[model samples]
Target: RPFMCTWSYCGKRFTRSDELQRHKRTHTGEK
Candidate 1:
C-alpha cells in the first residue's frame, strides 16, 4: 500500500507511512 501524508496544511505526500508519521510532528508542534 502506498503511504501518504494526511495533513492538508502541510500539503506533503510521503511514500512511506513512517515518514508521514514523523512529518506530522512538525505540524503538531511535537519535538
Candidate 2:
C-alpha cells in the first residue's frame, strides 16, 4: 500500500513508504 499524509502544517503531501521512512528521520535526533 502507498503511504499518505492526511494532515500537515502547510500543504498535504503523499509518498511511498520508503520515502516517508527516510523523511521521518529528520524528526529524530539520532544520526
Candidate 3:
C-alpha cells in the first residue's frame, strides 16, 4: 500500500508503515 502521512508538520509519503513511523519522530525528536 502507498502509505501516506497526515502529520500536520509534514506530509511525507511512505511505502511502508515503518518508514512513516521513522520519519514521524523527526518532528518531535522522540521515539
Candidate 4:
C-alpha cells in the first residue's frame, strides 16, 4: 500500500508511514 500525499498539487506517494512522515518535513516550513 502507498501513502498518498495531499499537498498542493503534490502527487507523491510513499511506501511506508515513516516515509510519509519524513516527507512532510519537506513541507514543514511550507504554508
Enumerate clash totals for all models, in the order shown: 0, 0, 0, 0
Cα lDDT over the full model 3: 0.73
Model 4: residue 20 alpha-carbon error in angstroms = 0.9
Residue range with the least summed lDDT across 10 consecutive positions in model 1: 21-30
lDDT of each: 0.73, 0.56, 0.73, 0.72
lDDT of 1 at 1: 50
lDDT of 2 by residue, 1-31 (tens): 5675433642445557765666655635766
Of candidates 4 and 1, the better by TM-score: 4
Worst 10 residues of 2 by lDDT: 5-14
- Name the regions of candidate 1 deviating beyond 4 angstroms: none
Q: Across residues 1-31, which tens digit of lDDT does each residue of candidate 1 receive?
A: 5777777777767777888767776878668
lDDT per residue, candidate 4, 9-28, as tens digits?
Answer: 67777778887667876866
Of the candidates shown, which would achieve the greatest TM-score relative to the real structure?
4
Root-mean-square deviation per candidate: 1.9, 3.5, 2.1, 2.7
- Tell how far residue 21 is off in model 3, in angstroms: 0.8
Q: Which residue runs of candidate 4 sit more than 4 Å off their true CA positions?
A: none
